[PDB]
């Protein structure tokens, strides 16, 4: 024993226990999801209202990369921000050299290789976040989810945090019941519902819903936050489904 005390040390299993411990920080965090729709993606997140003193709509969690990629994460929030800061540098250098905005699979590997690099040395700590991200590029919509190990895959639906099992079950129904696909406006409503359903795992404190989306038709393939009437419509739809 002692194989879990240092990052980048293989246990006799072939496991990096420090990465698996980072996963526990992720599992401890609030619920965040992603839904791939017909011509885009929708991101949503659970923001726990620790106190009445929190200013509503101000502590924004979802982050934009470039103008076309949305990022949301569960776990250690600063680690997520650090990863998005890197993502922005990667997306910038890509655009600088190649002119076109970074494709989503290209961007995914840039985060993937950076996170993976933090499992190669004992002098650094792995990332304490799973990051759901995606957007619209020249080849269409893409949704990804990226783990502390550097592992990522493409997804139809993705979920992470404390309410992930609840969310995953709901996403799996949508995939089965909509093989032809889901519309962007539908995905916003469903995202609201899934965060509300996943809130049963964090049910002690009340919460604040936050949604964003990229869609070729609804936002011209740019990342935008769902605000005002469209947000309230999604909250009403979610509130109706739980009751």
């Amino acid at each position: 024993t002692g194989y879990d005390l240092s990052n980048s040390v293989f246990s006799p299993d072939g496991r990096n226990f420090q990465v698996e411990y980072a996963v526990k920080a992720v599992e401890n965090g609030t619920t965040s999801i992603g839904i791939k729709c017909n011509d885009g993606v929708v991101f949503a997140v659970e923001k726990l209202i620790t106190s009445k003193l929190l200013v509503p709509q101000k502590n924004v969690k979802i982050q934009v990369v470039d103008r076309h990629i949305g990022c949301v994460y569960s776990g250690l929030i600063p680690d997520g921000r650090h990863l998005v800061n890197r993502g922005r540098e990667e997306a910038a250098s890509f655009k600088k050299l190649y002119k076109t905005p970074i494709p989503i699979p290209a961007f995914a590997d840039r985060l993937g290789q950076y996170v993976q690099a933090h499992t190669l040395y004992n002098s650094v700590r792995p990332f304490g976040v799973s990051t759901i991200f995606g957007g619209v590029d020249k080849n269409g919509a893409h949704l990804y989810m990226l783990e502390p190990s550097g592992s990522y895959w493409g997804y139809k639906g993705a979920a992470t945090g404390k309410g992930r099992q609840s969310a995953k079950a709901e996403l799996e129904k949508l995939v089965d019941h909509h093989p032809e696909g889901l519309s962007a406006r539908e995905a916003v409503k469903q995202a609201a519902k899934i965060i509300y359903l996943a809130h049963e795992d964090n049910k002690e404190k009340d919460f604040e819903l936050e949604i964003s989306w990229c869609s070729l038709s609804e936002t011209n393939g740019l990342h935008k936050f769902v605000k005002g009437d469209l947000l309230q419509e999604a909250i009403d739809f979610a509130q109706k489904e739980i009751n």
Binding site: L5, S6, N122, S123
Partner: protein, 244 residues
């Protein structure tokens, strides 16, 4: 981080000793004995090879006695690979001194430089010390014939006769018994070989086991000659002194 795996090679024990230096000296105590004896008309370097095999090519072999310049030679005790690193540094220091001052390096200056390199490894850098003890045999026009030794601590001292490596306690008692100040090279040759012959862990002392060298101011017309003895010449001097 990395701290976990750091041996900390450059620290004091509670008693005020340098762990790694002491353990390097323990390593050196197992190495083949090397003897240096300084006479009025020259210096002898005798040393015992460690790996007796009949298949070792002895005439092209060099584990013990190395040449630093025309005036200075060394006898090694410890890790040969470690010694060769230091030897090539010492060879360069001698040529740097020659290039700068247009004079051959004085023996003590060369010795001090090597000893200072060894010292550095005990005080900083976190690396293991060199597991080597040298006997320096040399000549210069200031002090004439000189014998020095250095060890992994980087401490050096001058000697009339000295041993390093295995059985030094026994060897130093025998040298202290039979050495005299008015002694000559031919007598010192005989003393060096007799001392090895008694202290050796082997059954008998033979030519194939020895490296032998002399620094004489008995070259043609008052110059100094370094003689590294060939296998046949070691065999002859063993018969001459009456050991085989």
């Amino acid at each position: 981080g990395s701290r976990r795996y750091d041996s900390r090679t450059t620290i004091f024990s509670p008693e005020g000793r340098l762990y790694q230096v002491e353990y390097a000296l323990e390593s050196i105590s197992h190495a083949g004995t090397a003897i240096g004896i300084m006479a009025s008309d020259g210096i002898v370097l005798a040393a015992e090879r460690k790996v007796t095999s009949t298949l070792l090519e002895q005439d092209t072999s060099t584990e013990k006695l190395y040449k630093l310049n025309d005036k200075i030679a060394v006898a090694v005790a410890g890790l040969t690979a470690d010694a060769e690193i230091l030897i090539n540094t010492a060879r360069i220091h001698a040529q740097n001194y020659l290039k700068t001052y247009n004079e051959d390096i004085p023996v003590e200056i060369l010795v001090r430089r090597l000893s200072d390199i060894k010292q550095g490894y005990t005080q900083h850098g976190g690396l293991r010390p060199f597991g080597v003890s040298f006997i320096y045999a040399g000549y210069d026009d200031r002090y004439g014939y000189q014998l020095y030794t250095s060890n992994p601590s980087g401490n050096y001292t001058g000697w009339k006769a000295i041993s390093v490596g295995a059985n030094t306690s026994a060897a130093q008692t025998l040298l202290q018994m039979d050495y005299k100040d008015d002694m000559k090279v031919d007598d010192a040759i005989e003393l060096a070989l007799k001392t090895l012959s008694k202290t050796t862990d082997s059954s008998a002392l033979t030519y194939d086991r020895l490296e032998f060298a002399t620094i004489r101011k008995g070259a043609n017309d008052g110059e100094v000659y370094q003689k590294i003895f060939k296998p046949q010449e070691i065999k002859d001097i063993l018969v001459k002194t009456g050991i085989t």
